[PDB]
Design a protein around this ligand. Structure first.
Ligand SMILES: [Cl-]
Ligand SMILES: [Cl-]
Ligand SMILES: [Cl-]
Ligand SMILES: [Cl-]
Ligand SMILES: [Cl-]
Ligand SMILES: [Cl-]
Ligand SMILES: [Cl-]
Ligand SMILES: [Mg+2]
Ligand SMILES: [Mg+2]
Ligand SMILES: [Mg+2]
Ligand SMILES: [Mg+2]
Ligand SMILES: [Mg+2]
Ligand SMILES: [Mg+2]
Ligand SMILES: [Mg+2]
Ligand SMILES: [Mg+2]
Ligand SMILES: [Mg+2]
Ligand SMILES: [Mg+2]
Ligand SMILES: [Mg+2]
Ligand SMILES: [Mg+2]
Ligand SMILES: [Mg+2]
Ligand SMILES: [Mg+2]
Ligand SMILES: [Mg+2]
Ligand SMILES: [Mg+2]
Ligand code: NA
Ligand code: NA
Ligand code: NA
Ligand code: NA
Ligand code: NA
Ligand code: NA
Ligand code: NA
Ligand code: NA
Ligand code: NA
Ligand code: NA
Ligand code: NA
Ligand code: NA
Ligand code: NA
Ligand code: NA
Ligand code: NA
Ligand code: NA
Lengths: 142, 150, 142, 49
RNA sequence: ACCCUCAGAAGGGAGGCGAAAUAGAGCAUGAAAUCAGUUGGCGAUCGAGCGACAGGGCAUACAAGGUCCCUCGACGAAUGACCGACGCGCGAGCGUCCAGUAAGACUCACGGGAAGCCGAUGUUCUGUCGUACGUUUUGAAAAACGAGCCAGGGAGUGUGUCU
RNA sequence: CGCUCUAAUUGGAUGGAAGUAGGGGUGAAAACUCCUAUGGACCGAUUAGUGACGAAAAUCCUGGCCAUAGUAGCAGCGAUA
RNA sequence: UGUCCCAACGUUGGGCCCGGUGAACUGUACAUUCCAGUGCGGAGUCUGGAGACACCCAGGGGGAAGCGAAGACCCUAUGGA
């Protein structure tokens, strides 16, 4: 009578102490929006980042308050870069064969959006039986 | 054209619409704004007074250069848009009629929703001095009305 | 009429600026202050130059306006306003919780703030706000 | 010759208009103009072997 | 189609077809600028590159994020005391000892708590910084030049030769 | 990093592709990806190629649209009807 | 002899209010400003103060170095006629 997600939704990965520490750091420190300069002043200018090139650009000159400029110094820790907030490393999956070789303790699987309901059902049931969490599970009424 | 922008329960509701009316869209917003919440019958009496010139329609948004009116309460500018008002009377005559053919008491129903939409312009051209012409168009207005039982 | 002042200050024979500076500091700390006997407050210096300054302020102005107070009442209050960011929310709140009075409408006798009192026996070059207002043309309503 | 079959000319300064070749009050020929030539198009002469 | 409405082969209402009429005639999809109505936030005593970063209010169906708060305790870089004891200084105050101790960012563990609750999103308030962008220029917020807004279009290419 | 089309290798889709709208996650970033709605037929990935391949600007081009504004004009003429 | 001293009253058409019709110019953004200062030496927007409750009608045009026109003057170009 209520919606329930298929699979090991609550499953968590096991990480070394150092990894969980770095994952916690990334989540705590975060980063600036890094949206293009003045995107908010002109509708025809989108948010997508572009290096400010103006010779007089206040942002390019690094004036405080004009937003941070993309730099390698803002990179996330190597050990955690790319991990789902849960700590799992994602593995894009298109079918049942893609599930092969996947470590359910270390990796979680994300079913490509294009996969239809018929194939998702199969993928979701065998992923769970392999101890693999499905980040984007189907919600069935049980 | 438009489609009803608000949901309406068929069992306690009556609908009506005007299509591509060549009248002032600005006078239409003002009129709709003023009669919403009124009784169909009240609306009819109101618009007839407007047409008669005894009742002003508050012009709250499109009021540049508009002279003040003593009967306008809580505001100053107002006018007597007879054309748009006549088109609304047609709209209400239809709604109230639809309402009656369905068993309700048309006149006593509340105007739950009323709104005008500019659906286009009948384009025109006006010759000007210096061998040039400029636009001279006519607004086309759609308007929805939903009557509801008290 | 009726002002729950947490502090009632007596300006009689005190240096307007030194009192104002303290009343400002206190109002920004959340205190409700009332300055009493404003007409008897005092400012050091050569009466002639002092009066020229205030007279200049009265004459200054234009259509936009420069409303400068003539009564010892407002002179003192305007003096305090200059020590507060009166255009900011916090500043206006503090300023509005301060009121100056001609004489003392209270029962209690206000207190004398430290380092604001002027010894009449060792000072001859000073003036009374009341005297200033009389020179400015104020109506001696005290 | 795609886009070049026109005698369109620019009016130059004087009418608050950009210096763009026009014909019958319609811009033409230049690459930034709709119906204008392709600036650096594919070419038959190119050796694709 | 039929019926009601209407000056009415208009339009509207109801109804019928079809998987779909929000496929109903320039009718596949249906962006932005923008308009009507309406929801959330602000709002008729208050100040202007519209924001970035911090932090508060209020607002939030699910999904695709799941964290967050407080007691205590563990660890604890740089830095680093009060009080008290003694000894100096005209004085503000300083010296020795207590002590590199208590403290000390992050992180973790036990117990307890939150689900509009944490993140996030909308808006608004407070703090810090802040006179667009691009170009011309020694020097541009510029009373130097360009653009009303948005979408789409809009600028190192080919042959030959040489290096 | 992203775009077009070609090739090899290999996948997705009417049990709902592309696109669009709103929303969630990742990446310093170019940008990748998921969810919900809409949509109703096509769509990728890796590798090697390909090129009429990326826009905020040029009094840039074309189209659409807002304010301007219910404003100017619909008076002036020896023919005031 | 209203050109002037020195302006008045009146006439007709507008102007103003109402119905109907219904454009254009112009627009980087923000914008209730004023006095000073500063700044590429001629600022609604920077700085300090002052003033400032919102909206609307009519007016005469002080400012936006107002709008309109890639300066005709002047010089420069191994420009043109
Ligand atoms: Cl890198
Ligand atoms: Cl309109
Ligand atoms: Cl004044
Ligand atoms: Cl202030
Ligand atoms: Cl003395
Ligand atoms: Cl840490
Ligand atoms: Cl190049
Ligand atoms: Mg934008
Ligand atoms: Mg008027
Ligand atoms: Mg002609
Ligand atoms: Mg062409
Ligand atoms: Mg369509
Ligand atoms: Mg120069
Ligand atoms: Mg483009
Ligand atoms: Mg392959
Ligand atoms: Mg550019
Ligand atoms: Mg255009
Ligand atoms: Mg106007
Ligand atoms: Mg006559
Ligand atoms: Mg200021
Ligand atoms: Mg020139
Ligand atoms: Mg000459
Ligand atoms: Mg010559
Ligand atoms: Na208005
Ligand atoms: Na009124
Ligand atoms: Na009234
Ligand atoms: Na003094
Ligand atoms: Na004054
Ligand atoms: Na031709
Ligand atoms: Na060839
Ligand atoms: Na907030
Ligand atoms: Na330039
Ligand atoms: Na600039
Ligand atoms: Na300037
Ligand atoms: Na325009
Ligand atoms: Na190109
Ligand atoms: Na132009
Ligand atoms: Na005369
Ligand atoms: Na003016």
């Amino acid at each position: 009578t209520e919606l329930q997600a298929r699979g090991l939704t609550e499953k968590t990965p096991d990480l070394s102490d150092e990894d969980a520490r770095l994952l916690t750091q990334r989540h705590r420190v975060g980063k600036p929006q890094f949206n293009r300069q003045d995107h908010h002043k002109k509708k025809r200018v989108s948010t997508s980042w572009r290096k400010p090139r103006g010779q007089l650009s206040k942002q390019r000159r690094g004036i405080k308050g004009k937003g941070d400029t993309v730099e390698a110094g803002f990179r996330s820790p190597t050990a955690v870069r790319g991990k789902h907030p849960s700590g799992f490393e994602e593995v894009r999956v298109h079918n049942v064969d893609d599930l092969e070789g996947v470590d359910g303790d270390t990796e979680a699987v994300r079913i490509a959006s294009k996969v239809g309901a018929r194939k998702r059902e199969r993928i979701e049931e065998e992923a769970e039986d392999a101890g693999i969490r499905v980040l984007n599970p189907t919600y069935v009424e049980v | 054209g438009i489609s009803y922008s608000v949901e309406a329960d068929p069992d306690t509701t009556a609908k009506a619409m005007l299509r591509e009316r060549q009248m002032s869209f600005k006078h239409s917003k003002a009129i709709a704004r003023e009669i919403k919440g009124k009784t169909a019958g009240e609306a009819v009496d109101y618009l007839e007074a407007v047409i008669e010139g005894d009742q002003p329609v508050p012009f709250k948004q499109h009021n540049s250069g508009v002279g003040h009116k003593s009967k306008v309460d809580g505001w100053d500018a107002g006018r007597y848009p007879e054309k748009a008002s006549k088109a609304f009377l047609d709209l209400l005559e239809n709604a109230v009629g639809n309402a009656d053919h369905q068993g309700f008491d048309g006149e006593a129903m509340t105007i739950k929703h009323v709104a005008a939409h500019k659906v286009g312009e009948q384009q025109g051209r006006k010759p000007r001095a210096m061998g040039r012409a400029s636009a001279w168009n006519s607004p086309q207005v759609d308007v929805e009305l939903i009557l509801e039982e008290p | 009429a009726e002002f729950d002042a947490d502090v009632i200050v007596d300006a009689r024979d005190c240096i307007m600026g030194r009192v104002a500076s303290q009343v400002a500091e206190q109002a920004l700390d959340g205190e409700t202050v009332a300055v009493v006997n404003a007409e008897r407050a005092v400012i050091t210096g050569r009466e002639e130059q002092i009066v020229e300054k205030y007279e200049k302020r009265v004459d200054i102005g234009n259509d936009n306006g420069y409303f400068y107070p003539k009564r010892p009442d407002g002179i003192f209050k305007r003096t305090i306003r200059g020590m507060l960011p009166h255009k900011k929310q916090r500043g206006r709140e503090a300023f509005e919780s301060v009121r100056v009075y001609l004489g003392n409408p209270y029962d209690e006798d206000g207190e004398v703030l430290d380092g604001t009192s002027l010894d009449r026996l060792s000072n001859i070059k000073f003036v009374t706000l009341g005297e200033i207002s009389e020179t400015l043309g104020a109506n001696k309503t005290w | 010759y795609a886009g070049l079959r026109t005698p369109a000319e620019s009016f130059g300064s004087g009418r608050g208009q950009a210096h763009v070749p026009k014909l019958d009050g319609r811009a033409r020929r230049v690459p930034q103009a709709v119906k204008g030539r392709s600036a650096h198009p594919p070419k038959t002469e190119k050796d694709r072997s």
